[PDB]
Design a protein around this ligand. Structure first.
Ligand SMILES: [Ca+2]
Length: 212
């Protein structure tokens, strides 16, 4: 519950920008195109997590996300992700040339439920020819939505997380880049987020949870 909404001074859906968070034992610092935007120092997470990206439509959170109006198909794109480790032999660079089942997995066949109003499908996670991860939010039947979530198989710790992306624009949805660990992985709920609320892509929301 440490939400911070920052003005970008640009529309993030119009092209690629680099977003990042430096996660260290005593702070979290977030950057947009190399520029420091926000610092947090109270109760900073410490459990290593998976790197995740998704796109989804919400329900019951109209005041936060705006109401979703069924517009589809909608796409969020990611050109690369870089993690610079505090430890040697931990760093990696992922260009998104193709699906690498050794390091990533696609969510498929279930819903997160709750505020999430869509089912994850492996078919909505595709790779463009010019190397971009492309997540899609589609519909298979009247008012029935399918969404996409790509996530690392390994867990990562303190260090610099960077991503080049272009979020979707549309009332009711979220395009995100985040680290996560929680009861499903046998640990406490630690997460750090970069979330773009589709209702206004001229702003970005930063958040984190420690033992949520
Ligand atoms: Ca790429």
């Amino acid at each position: 519950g440490h939400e911070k909404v920052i003005s970008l001074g640009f529309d993030a859906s119009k092209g690629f920008h680099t977003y990042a968070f430096d996660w260290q034992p005593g702070y979290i610092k977030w950057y947009v195109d190399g520029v420091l935007k926000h610092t947090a120092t109270a109760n900073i997470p410490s459990t290593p997590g998976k790197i995740m990206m998704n796109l989804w439509n919400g329900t019951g959170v109209d005041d936060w996300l705006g109401s979703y109006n069924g517009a589809n198909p909608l796409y969020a794109e990611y050109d690369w992700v870089k993690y610079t480790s505090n430890q040697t032999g931990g760093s990696f660079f992922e260009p998104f040339n193709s699906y690498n089942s050794g390091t990533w997995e696609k969510a498929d066949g279930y819903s997160n439920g709750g505020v999430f109003n869509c089912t994850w499908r492996a078919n909505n996670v595709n790779f463009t020819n010019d190397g971009k991860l492309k997540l899609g939010l589609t519909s298979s039947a009247y008012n029935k939505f399918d969404c996409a979530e790509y996530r690392s198989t390994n867990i990562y710790g303190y260090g610099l997380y960077e991503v080049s992306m272009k979020p979707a624009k549309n009332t009711g949805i979220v395009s995100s880049f985040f680290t996560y660990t929680g009861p499903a992985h046998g640990t406490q709920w630690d997460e750090i987020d970069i979330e773009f609320l589709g209702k206004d892509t001229t702003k970005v929301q930063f958040n984190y949870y420690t033992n949520g």
